[PDB]
Amino acid sequence: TYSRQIKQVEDDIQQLLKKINELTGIKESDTGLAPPALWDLAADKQTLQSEQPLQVARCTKIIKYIINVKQFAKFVVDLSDQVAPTDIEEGMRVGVDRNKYQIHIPLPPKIDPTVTMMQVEEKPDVTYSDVGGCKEQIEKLREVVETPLLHPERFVNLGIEPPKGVLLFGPPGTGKTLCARAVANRTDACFIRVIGSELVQKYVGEGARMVRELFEMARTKKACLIFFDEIDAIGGARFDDGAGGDNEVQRTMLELINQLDGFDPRGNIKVLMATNRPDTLDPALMRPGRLDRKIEFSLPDLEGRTHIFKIHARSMSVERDIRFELLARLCPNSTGAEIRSVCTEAGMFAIRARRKIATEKDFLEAVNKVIKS
Amino acid sequence: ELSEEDKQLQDELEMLVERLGEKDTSLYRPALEELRRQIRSSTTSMTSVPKPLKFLRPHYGKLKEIYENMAPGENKRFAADIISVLAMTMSGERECLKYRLVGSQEELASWGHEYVRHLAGEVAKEWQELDDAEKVQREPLLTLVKEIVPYNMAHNAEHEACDLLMEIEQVDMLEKDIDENAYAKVCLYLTSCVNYVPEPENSALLRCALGVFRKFSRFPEALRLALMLNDMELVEDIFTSCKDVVVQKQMAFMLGRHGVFLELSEDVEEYEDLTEIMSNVQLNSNFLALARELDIMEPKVPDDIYKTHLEDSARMNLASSFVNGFVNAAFGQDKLLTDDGNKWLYKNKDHGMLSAAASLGMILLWDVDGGLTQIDKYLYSSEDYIKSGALLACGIVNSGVRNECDPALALLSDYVLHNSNTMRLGSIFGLGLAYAGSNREDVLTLLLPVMGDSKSSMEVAGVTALACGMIAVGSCNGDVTSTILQTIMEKSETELKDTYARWLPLGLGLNHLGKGEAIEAILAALEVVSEPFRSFANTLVDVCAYAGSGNVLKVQQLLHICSEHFDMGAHQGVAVLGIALIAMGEEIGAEMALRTFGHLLRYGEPTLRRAVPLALALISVSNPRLNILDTLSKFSHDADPEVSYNSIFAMGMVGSGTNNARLAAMLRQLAQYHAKDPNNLFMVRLAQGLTHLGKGTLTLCPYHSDRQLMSQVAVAGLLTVLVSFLDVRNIILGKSHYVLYGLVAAMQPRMLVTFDEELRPLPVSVRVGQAVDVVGQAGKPKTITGFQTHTTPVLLAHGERAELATEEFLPVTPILEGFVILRKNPNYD
Amino acid sequence: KRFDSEKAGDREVQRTMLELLNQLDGFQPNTQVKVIAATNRVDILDPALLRSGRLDRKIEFPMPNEEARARIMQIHSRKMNVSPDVNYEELARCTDDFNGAQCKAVCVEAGMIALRRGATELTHEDYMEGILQYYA
Amino acid sequence: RLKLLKLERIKDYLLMEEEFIRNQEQMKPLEEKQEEERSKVDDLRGTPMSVGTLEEIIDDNHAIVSTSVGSEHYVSILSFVDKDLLEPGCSVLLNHKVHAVIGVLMDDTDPLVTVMKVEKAPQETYADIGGLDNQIQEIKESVELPLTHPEYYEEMGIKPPKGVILYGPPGTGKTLLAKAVANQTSATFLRVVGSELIQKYLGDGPKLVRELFRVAEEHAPSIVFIDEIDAIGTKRYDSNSGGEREIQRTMLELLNQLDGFDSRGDVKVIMATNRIETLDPALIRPGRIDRKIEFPLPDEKTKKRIFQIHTSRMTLADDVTLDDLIMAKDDLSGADIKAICTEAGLMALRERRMKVTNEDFKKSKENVLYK
Amino acid sequence: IDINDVTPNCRVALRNDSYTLHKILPNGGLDKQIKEIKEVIELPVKHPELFEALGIAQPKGVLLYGPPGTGKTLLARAVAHHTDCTFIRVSGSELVQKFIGEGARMVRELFVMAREHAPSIIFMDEIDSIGSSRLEGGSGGDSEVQRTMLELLNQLDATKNIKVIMATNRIDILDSALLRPGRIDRKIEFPPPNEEARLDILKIHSRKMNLTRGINLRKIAELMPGASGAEVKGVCTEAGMYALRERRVHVTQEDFEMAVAKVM
């Protein structure tokens, strides 16, 4: 009935769309201008007044100033309708025009595609109150990551240093990534996830660069929350033995540490270090001057298991009444990820029973199956 | 092939069926019990081609034969069980649904859920095919509905139950089954009635929803649906209960914000505070308090709102004054106020008229104290244009401001009868817009007698009609209709096709806005008015009369009337504007109405081309999406000056009170490009002003309450402005340009002060994110997209909602907006 | 050691090392220079880079004693809103090989710990737990 | 109600568009002339000698375009462009004089997809899969009906399983079931093996892994068939020798791709393993991988079915009886049965008789048996 | 013309100013291997029906694994002579990067001629040069011989009666995709040493020179026992060198003895 009505009406829509296409006719082929008009004569004229090249300014020698510019053609130029002389900066991207080469427009700095898309400006879809079994850990993380930011005058009155650096560690799967996502979503600051694999490249020179540009980007931004993951992958025991050929990763780790805290302030950057094997981590990095508030995620207790159970039960089609504390009791030594998989198994059991209700019986069957496997 | 176990199971089932030819020993009760056992097995098993079925095809006919064979008794329904299952799989559209279900009432344990689904479908379609007859066979349908609804409510299929009820016209049935768990689901489902097929017949959906809400004591949203149903009597009845002080104050806040005028005196508890809440006396103080929180009380020079550094006739002087008034909304410009006041006072020239005084009125909008005081101490004297400026400033200050005191009404009634035609026009405009939507009768009785404007100008007649239309705001006031009729009698052959003639149609449509079936009498009066006229404004009459409809019968009528080519295209313009004025709600419908309007602009006459951008603004008011901005810029750089005017103002409107950086950059680039066009530069300046309305604190919006509530006064003002801009060249680029002030009166904010009990500004952390259309999705959908915890003093956005926090407080409303209260009673921390 | 022949990148590091050696050992007085080197892998380093015209006076950083730990914690607590009651020396004793910045990290953690409740005093044992069955 | 909404508005579309557009077409003029005018104006917008490479985009109307000579030049784009196709690294078209961005054209990509996607619909289908009904139904539940019927999961609440492991001895139709899933499903299956991702140098393996995952997400919501991984990583060891450390990094990247910080599309992972006890305990984490499936050796009846399905395209002789081969109660995978059939056929061909014989099948049995 | 006669790889003239195309520019002892190959190659070619009742496909790809000088040549000659079907040879690195872009087109023409001369024997000696194990970089992202391999596999799979003989010196390097079903399937190895094989190869490669009678090539083959194949060709060439050094064109047993001694 309803399904057939759907099929009919969607057939009508497909027919309408093809009819529109054939009747009027809009396509691109190779390049196109489908949006009507788009006349851009003034655009051409101002492009001629512009369409400038860019390079990297080097030095402003004199106090009319002498800007020095380097690309496939060196140059020494200055002056422009632009003001804020060299925007009080030298190593920018100048953006200078042709035709006597003295008119400029400042540009941001070039950055490799890797970091460009590692910026990860997206907001993960997680929020607090969806976390159970690690109330103490989340309390610690909330304190460290928010008190310096949210009404932090109370945090400065006491004359106490602001902690900077937290390493999340624990068994594989405890809601560490979940809590990282939640903090990312809630926070309002330059957030930057980092993947360890992207820091391993073809021979020396790559990781150290990308790390340095990442760090200067964070410094340029007002306040950064960096989110290293795969720290187990990036940075390990400094010992060489046979790693005399593999010293590249160790080198990159060394530069990472130096930028974290070397002979220069590191800045308003708070670091999150995701891991599950917090022993091979190098001592220099693990130094508490760089990872202040290491947090440990443990297997949830009964209350945490129940809270995670109801959280996952947030979904609909579930039974009207379930007895979650017994569910948790039946699943001891179970990760929150295992609670999630138990809810998934209950849903799949409902489907394989052709039932639109997820019953406590379905939950019990799922628990039995997961326990047996 | 088949498996041996299978083939044996069938063989046994058939052999049973053939031996079934009469009632005897195992034949009737035990053999049919065997069959029902296999049916129970089939339902319990998978939807995987149950073995008993798909092989007993002639056996369906044989079971029918056995049914008509055995005499009545214990049989005739226990076999009807088997017959009805074989029907569902094969046949028996209604016969089985009737007799088998008359047997074994409900209790569909041995049948599963698909059985229940298809019986529901068959019953609904049987009711559909049964016209207003078959009462004897309809009572069984009522019993069927009673049987089916509670099981559906239990299982999970409340959406299917809602379907059943809608297509069976059983709105007032579930009132006895709704539960404390499913009330939200059913209420949301009822609210989601964009087809509202019953509504043109009658608001049965709203009726049952309001019954449920009053039964469950959810007064806020009960009142929301009460307003949705245009019956002030019903709204008053809902508000009457007043069993809780907190909820009473909350619903008073909603009534005041919507501007619906309550009626009572010193006769009930909390009468004074409820009256103040509804009157909105505290709105200005609360707005100023929020501004102080993150103080924004900094006057900005027109260029500062612009960025002229990045690179003075009446025209640009007034344009800059308008920009300043838009950006500084109720912020008390004070020093910059006086500076620009002296500037435009010196620049008083041609159109350097009361306009700028009304601008000061906007800067002091809702500032009854500051605005009235400032205008009184520095205004009036000579220059009847300056006195009209004072009158309109008072009107603006009082716009949407309710109070028994009549600071605007008294003055404008005093100076209504002054001979000066333009000053009287301004006075009447101020009077209308000061209490636009109040719907009272004092000013109507004071104005309708002076509707007769044979001694005055037709523009005065039209603007007075618009004032009465503001007041009536859809009341279909018979007095308004009568005075419009005498105006038509006073009408002239040529005055219609000169300018401003649309105002009288505009006022009639205001009086009869989206009434419903009264649009029939509206068209009757349209045919009654047989003036020597080129229709068109009659089309506007009908258009502004019918509105708020998600269906497209009037939409197709208007589309075809415009489609007939007019090789007098203002008729098509009003037709497209009416298409917009019908499609304003449903998001997909609005998007695709914009697509259709783009089709119109591309394959349309220049008249339709000038018309389209206004309709685009109507659809996307204060909703500057990238695609719509691209289109509006595209057709604002058009060669035709009128097209460019319409598109530039439409883009300013879609950017209204948003301050989007991309929009502002595009705006300034377009201003640079149109460097030699004075009127275009004026309009672009007003466009920046719109982009910066109250520095992005006040946003006019027809829709409201999570895209649920219709703003009657807002639609009135917006439609006035857009009708005025239908012909920008003559209507605006000339004498009259104060319909923008009408829009200003129509203005309103978007803001989330959590002023708790006793208006205490209790702060709270609120997670805000773009809406997600909670309907249908899994569990309790995360309405918040991109959680941005930002305390209480937030501004939300065109389409984002809030979720507060875990359990800190209990809001009195789940549609958080404007003035709200947060009960400090968490169940447990 | 400069002789290991693992693979590429190695040899680049050896040219850079040899460039360093040149820059201070060649036909150049290099009078107006002061090189100060910093390393932690003390043992594994180039025998020529080692010293005697290149990196002499190889100052050594030892593990702080109890007194040194007391002094460092005092230094980091100087600006700390410490109450007029401290067992600094006994906290240094508790350190028990707490050499590195751990002292600073602990003073910060103590600040946060007191800030749980808004205090200005040292519990002296919640301080150890900030520091960081069967028998006993 | 939702059906009512969609039907109502859909009819609105048909009526609105069809009627008005057909009215305009009946008065066809005022469209073709404008279209030709616009097309010739675009042509007028310089189309000499022209090409461009897009390094990045600043914002609307402004972007940086680099030429083969490194002509990095920044230019204000011309709106005539298609827009939204300006992904960094795209091949842009630039005016010879002003280097105005007016067009973009790549129409050519890395053939990695064409290499790792071969014979998308192999000759083996579920009919060719003789037996293993339980495993077949479970894998369908895990993979297909989530995609072919994205309604049940959506209405009930959960999302489908992401990673599914198939573990069993060396040869039990794992790749066969992968192929059948590919053929039956409309999605662009992806074959992958464990002996190629082990790259010569650091970062190469994880780089190609990430590229493979991104390709899977982009081109199609499909399956990725990761064959043996025990040769990779085998859990996270003490991480001492450089090669194994790098391979552990590769698995950790795999783990991030399987379930990372950001998100995951509608791409399902299917693992095939000879041995499972040795795999990373963390990788199989129930949040990431679920529905580990035994793929054991066929029993006697499964062996009958496998012989029958293999030999369906094999005109067995009247004397040839396929029961002496079921006789052997020892290790005989589906691959073993295929080898037996092929060896019998080849030996019959060698001994020149067009028809296979029971003795030929016997000899094939002895010469296919390894131990 | 509208590229009416221009494949998208050809020279064309472009005006200096206002660039414009114009005036298009123009361009013994190997019995077991002999048998094995004879069956596997001709039986499918000669009697395709021998697989219809089998309900299987005709084998269409064989791969030889030989030493440097031994095999891969005598067997190819025997197949060409004893098989009437066309014997095309693209031996050597006939797809090496020497000519890129047009290498794919040369593969196209190879397939075209193979289809035309159906059945055909596409001899391809030393695939190792073009056919190295698919690994390292590219993995399908490279436009090099890896791209050529991908194109070859795509074109292959389907052959009806054509047959393909890959050959290489080392089996160590191989491609999983190529060796997978639907592509080169069967394999066979070669034995380096044989007295009769060495003697006959000696005669064959000494054929193109003025030899003198009264000479025991049997003795020479025996006296060069630890000898490979092309090694024998080098032996013959150095024997010619010694014949020249003797200042006479009478290539003699003395010259062959001296050349064998120098070679060993």
Ligand SMILES: Nc1ncnc2c1ncn2[C@@H]1O[C@H](COP(=O)(O)OP(=O)(O)OP(=O)(O)O)[C@@H](O)[C@H]1O
């Ligand atoms: N406290 C929790 N509350 C809710 N869900 C949780 C919690 N802990 C774990 N889970 C569930 O476990 C899975 C979280 O995996 P996540 O990636 O965040 O873990 P992790 O600790 O970072 O480690 P791993 O990467 O080894 O899985 C999801 O299923 C999440 O639902």
Ligand SMILES: Nc1ncnc2c1ncn2[C@@H]1O[C@H](COP(=O)(O)OP(=O)(O)O)[C@@H](O)[C@H]1O
């Ligand atoms: N139902 C089946 N179960 C297992 N193997 C089968 C089945 N049907 C056919 N086969 C045979 O199994 C072989 C494939 O096994 P494969 O997937 O390679 O195992 P593995 O991947 O463990 O090596 C094919 O040659 C096919 O003929």
Ligand SMILES: [Mg+2]
């Ligand atoms: Mg995790």
Ligand SMILES: [Mg+2]
């Ligand atoms: Mg396999």
